[PDB]
Amino acid sequence: KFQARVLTLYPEMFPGFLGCSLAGQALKQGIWSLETVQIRDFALSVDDTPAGGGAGMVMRADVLAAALDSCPNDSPRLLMSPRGRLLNQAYARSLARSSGVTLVCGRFEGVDERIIEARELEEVSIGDYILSGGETAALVLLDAIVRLLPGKCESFENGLLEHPQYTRPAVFEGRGIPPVLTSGHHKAIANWRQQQAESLTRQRRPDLYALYNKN
Amino acid sequence: KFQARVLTLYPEMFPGFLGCSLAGQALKQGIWSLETVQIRDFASVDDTPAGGGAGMVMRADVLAAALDSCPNDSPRLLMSPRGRLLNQAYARSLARSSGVTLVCGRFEGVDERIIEARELEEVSIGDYILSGGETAALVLLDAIVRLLPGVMGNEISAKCESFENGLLEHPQYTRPAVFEGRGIPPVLTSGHHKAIANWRQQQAESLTRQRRPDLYALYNKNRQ
């Protein structure tokens, strides 16, 4: 098994698109399971006014604690957040090797800092943009995990985007597959592919290109 | 009325969660629409990479026909690991268009000639591999739709997030007054707005410095 547990205000978003395609099938076959936990059941509601003022509502430490504490501590506890460490492939690979993951989905403008500390929530961002709630990010994290489950290193992890890619037809709107690729001249092919990739990354992802140069 | 068109092998993944909450509410009041185009209608979709490679490659002609089946009234984006990185600024830009056309790359590789010829701008949501572009498209929609200048709350919203300034958001506190021994920092209760803002900022600086040196470098550039 791979046990996914998601703490959410919207359990009906799960499994969402992960009910479809290969992810759906793996679920139907029990390669992974998904448990949702409705946070609103733990309000003896879930969020309140920010001390010192602010733009939106803050998730209460007490409600969230009770929700976490109803769950076994069987997997790392990850808070979907704009403040998190960034999701990367190394980390997805790292997580697909576990027996499971616990995801907490905030919907508001934040989560009470004292519960982040007290229950060791690791904050995780999927990137520097705002989404409608943590659920969006949870689905994405799960997508990148489930994918790596039984049933290898990405070129960008080396600092390089993928070279341009071609298949048939041999000519589309007067544009032909570059002839070096159909030459059988392996060395020329690899050179060509390298220069295109270097050139593309330098222009479009200088950050990646910088890590390419840092070795 | 914002017009999203999504070219996909899995129309059934849509609207998905965008059907829910306020994104779906906005869908009901017709602030935006979501049309799916099945790529397979323009038949196989993928094929062998010229000069070898790792997977199959999406055919230029199948995607042309799919794109040409509806009008170019919209920026065209291709969901790809090769893309520029999605950020909030970019999201705001698209949110100001009449619509967006999103092509979901599934199999790893899309014929370069179709990217050139239909001017598909490649976009990645981050340096991690997903099951398909469907995943990237949904996230991209999620981030755009909430900025559509029809949605409620939207009118008086902050135009810029703190990470764009190079800082993570300050830590937040709410009731109860004391949780398992910990109080709410007293300055937050002091009625002294300037003091609150300074303290919140110091907390933000110190978190960003440790967790995102990349954002902090940007923070340093700005105040210079």
DSSP secondary structure letters along B12-66: GGSSGGGGSHHHHHHHHTTSEEEEEEEGGGG---EEPPTT--SS-EE-HHHHHHH
- Residue A131, marked binder: yes
- Write down the CATH superfamily of domain B162-224: tRNA(m1g37)methyltransferase, domain 2 (1.10.1270.20)
CA distance B164 to B166: 5
* Phi-psi group of A22: left, alpha or beta (phi > 0 → left; psi -120 to 50 → alpha; rest → beta): alpha
Q: Does B169 touch chain A (CB under 8 A)?
A: yes
CA distance A206 to A94: 26
| Closest approach of A74 to chain B, Cα-based (Å) | 22
| Sign of the CA dihedral running A187, A166, A143, A156 | positive
- Residue A177, marked binder: no
Three-state DSSP at A209 gives: helix
Q: Does B20 touch chain A (CB under 8 A)?
A: yes
Please list, residue by residue across A102-131, b when 16 or more beta carbons sit within 10 angstroms of its beta carbon and e when fewer do: bbbbbbbbbbbbbbbebbebebbbbbbbbb
Amino acid at the residue A112: D
| Closest approach of B62 to chain A, Cα-based (Å) | 10
CA distance A84 to A123: 4
Cα B66 to the chain's mean position, in Å? 23
Three-state DSSP at B191 gives: coil
- Residue A128, marked binder: yes
* End-to-end C-alpha distance for chain A, whole angstroms: 39
Chain A hits for B127, CB-CB cut-off 8 Å, are 86, 88-89, 154, 156-157
Question: How many Cβ atoms from other residues are within 10 Å of residue A155's Cβ?
Answer: 16
For B219, the enclosing helix (H) or strand (E) is helix B213-222
CA distance A17 to A36: 15
Rounded to the nearest 10 degrees, the angle between the axes of helix A134-146 and helix B133-145 is 170
CATH number attached to the domain at A1-154: 3.40.1280.10
Please list, residue by residue across A161-182, b when 16 or more beta carbons sit within 10 angstroms of its beta carbon and e when fewer do: bbbbbbbeeeebeebebbeebe
Give the residue from A114, A182, A205, A212 with the most B CB atoms within 10 Å of its CB, the best one to mutate. A114
Q: Solved how?
A: X-ray
Judge: B174–A49 Cβ closer than 8 Å, yes or no: yes
B46-47 and B57-58 strand pairing: antiparallel
Find where tokens 């009325």 sit.
Answer: B1
CA distance B88 to B90: 5
B32-38 and B99-104 strand pairing: unpaired
Q: Does A16 touch chain B (CB under 8 A)?
A: yes
**Contact criterion met (CB below 8 Å) for A123 and B212:** no
Resolution (A): 2.5
| Sign of the CA dihedral running B136, B139, B141, B144 | negative
CA distance A189 to A176: 16
Tokens standing for residue B60: 């230029």
CA distance A177 to A166: 6
Tokens standing for residue A101: 């993951």
Cβ burial of B52 (10 Å; 0-12, 13-18, 19+) is exposed
| Closest approach of A120 to chain B, Cα-based (Å) | 14
Q: Which of A137, A103, A100 is nearest to A122 (CA)?
A: A103
Q: Which of A156, A189, A153, A173 is nearest to B50 (CA)?
A: A189
CA distance A128 to A134: 13
CA distance A145 to A91: 9
Closest chain A residue to the Cα of B141, Cα to Cα: A131
What stretches of chain A show up as alpha helix (H) in DSSP?
A: 21-28, 61-69, 89-96, 113-118, 134-146, 186-204, 206-213
Could you give the strand order of the β-sheet that contains B121-124, starting from the edge strand earlier in sequence? B32-38, B2-8, B99-104, B76-85, B121-124
**Contact criterion met (CB below 8 Å) for A108 and A58:** yes
Fold of the domain built from segment(s) A155-215:
Trp Operon Repressor; Chain A (1.10.1270)
Q: What is the CA radius of gyration of chain A?
A: 22
- Cβ partners under 8 Å of residue B28, min gap 6: none
Chain A hits for B48, CB-CB cut-off 8 Å, are 167-168
Instruction: Locate the domains of chain A by residue range.
Output: 1-154, 155-215
CA distance A163 to B212: 29
Q: How many Cα atoms sit within 13 Å of B37 on the Cβ side?
A: 21
**Contact criterion met (CB below 8 Å) for A199 and A212:** no
Residue B46 backbone phi and psi in degrees, to 5: -120, 165
Closest chain B residue to the Cα of A178, Cα to Cα: B50
CATH 3.40.1280.10 fits B1-161, yes or no: yes
Cβ burial of B217 (10 Å; 0-12, 13-18, 19+) is exposed
Residue A131 backbone phi and psi in degrees, to 5: -115, 165
Q: Which of A107, A14, A101 is nearest to A63 (CA)?
A: A107
